[PDB]
Amino acid sequence: GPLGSMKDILSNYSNLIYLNKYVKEKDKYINDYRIIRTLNQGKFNKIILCEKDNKFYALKKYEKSLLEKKRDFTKSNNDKISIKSKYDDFKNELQIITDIKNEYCLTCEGIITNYDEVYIIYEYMENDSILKFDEYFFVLDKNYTCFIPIQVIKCIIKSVLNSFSYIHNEKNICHRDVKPSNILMDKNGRVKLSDFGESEYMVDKKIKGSRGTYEFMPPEFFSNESSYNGAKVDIWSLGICLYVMFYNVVPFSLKISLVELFNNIRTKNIEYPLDRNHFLYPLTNFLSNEDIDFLKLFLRKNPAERITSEDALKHEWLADTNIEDLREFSKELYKKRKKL
Numbered sequence: 001g002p003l004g005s006m007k008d009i010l011s012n013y014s015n016l017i018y019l020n021k022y023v024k025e026k027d028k029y030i031n032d033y034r035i036i037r038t039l040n041q042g043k044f045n046k047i048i049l050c051e052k053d054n055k056f057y058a059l060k061k062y063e064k065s066l067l068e069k070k071r072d073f074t075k076s077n078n079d080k081i082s083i084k085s086k087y088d089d090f091k092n093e094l095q096i097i098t099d100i101k102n103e104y105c106l107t108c109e110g111i112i113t114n115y116d117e118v119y120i121i122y123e124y125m126e127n128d129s130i131l132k133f134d135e136y137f138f139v140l141d142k143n144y145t146c147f148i149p150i151q152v153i154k155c156i157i158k159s160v161l162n163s164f165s166y167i168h169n170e171k172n173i174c175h176r177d178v179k180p181s182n183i184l185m186d187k188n189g190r191v192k193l194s195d196f197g198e199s200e201y202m203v204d205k206k207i208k209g210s211r212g213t214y215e216f217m218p219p220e221f222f223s224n225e226s227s228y229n230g231a232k233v234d235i236w237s238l239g240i241c242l243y244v245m246f247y248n249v250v251p252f253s254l255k256i257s258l259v260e261l262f263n264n265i266r267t268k269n270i271e272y273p274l275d276r277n278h279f280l281y282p283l284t285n286f287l288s289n290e291d292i293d294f295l296k297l298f299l300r301k302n303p304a305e306r307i308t309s310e311d312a313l314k315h316e317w318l319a320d321t322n323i324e325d326l327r328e329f330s331k332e333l334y335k336k337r338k339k340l
């Protein structure tokens with residue numbers, strides 16, 4: 001149960017670098033990585049775009065002294081209350097990051113620390129996330145409202161599935177937070193699963209839940225079960241990601257107030273119209289039977305009836321996948337970002 005000190009966790013890491021910040025002229029460095037701008041601030045960590053050798057990198061900053069103060073209740077097994085700081089959570093996130101090595105997952109290239117401040121060195125995925133959220137999901141702009149073409153979606157889904165194969169099957173890790181935010185894309189254009197901050201190791205293929213992002217949580221979480229199968233949880237979440245990719249919106253879980261949310265998921269049936277339906281009125285093409293055939297296999301309420309990562313991978317939908325679809329999109333999308 002109890003993980004040790006950070007030192008004990010990183011005691012087996014082979015590329016642990018000693019923290020050295022410094023300032024040369026108007027520029028701020030972290031071990032030769034020049035600080036450009038912060039790409040995204042998640043208020044448990046920030047992600048920093050950096051430069052070293054005419055190459056771009058992305059360095060996830062964590063801070064022990066800031067994280068150990070944030071302390072929520074968890075309630076133990078034994079009546080007597082237990083407390084867990086968000087730093088405890090990071091201890092587990094480290095261990096995980098420390099052993100992800102995969103071409104479909106975001107793998108770190110080295111960890112920089114002084115045992116308080118941590119910087120995790122990742123490759124820079126020039127196209128940020130799969131989609132960006134602001135009152136709704138969009139590709140590039142709020143004024144330009146484009147839908148990711150289906151021929152390209154396939155790749156994205158195929159690519160993440162492969163990630164799933166590695167974390168579930170090779171590593172025995174459940175992601176527990178599959179989200180457009182965490183599905184990252186470069187210019188070339190590969191797609192890699194990232195962010196392991198809710199991830200944990202499975203026990204006989206299962207997890208102990210009520211943790212992640214509410215609209216991406218499976219119906220199981222709303223039964224009297226305590227152990228849910230980890231793989232299928234990730235799969236459901238990918239289903240939501242697909243739904244989001246389809247109609248650029250969250251399913252029945254349309255935010256506003258969240259009792260409506262938690263009371264719907266477990267029993268309410270998902271409506272499957274044609275792309276712009278949900279998105280028409282905050283502005284004032286579409287899809288086929290086969291498209292929904294695949295998404296429904298993902299979003300089945302009973303998880304045992306829900307499609308495996310195995311069956312999904314070898315399905316008729318992804319049979320006609322072409323990486324040239326993802327390549328052109330990613331290369332063109334990158335062209336539009338450069339000066340935006």
Ligand SMILES: NC1=NC(=O)C([C@@H]2CCNC(=O)C3=NC(Br)=CC32)=N1
Binds near residue numbers: 057124129
């Ligand atoms: N949730 C996230 N965990 C992460 O490690 C990231 C990264 C770091 C990987 N590389 C990049 O280039 C990124 N661009 C953007 Br936006 C975010 C990220 N996000």
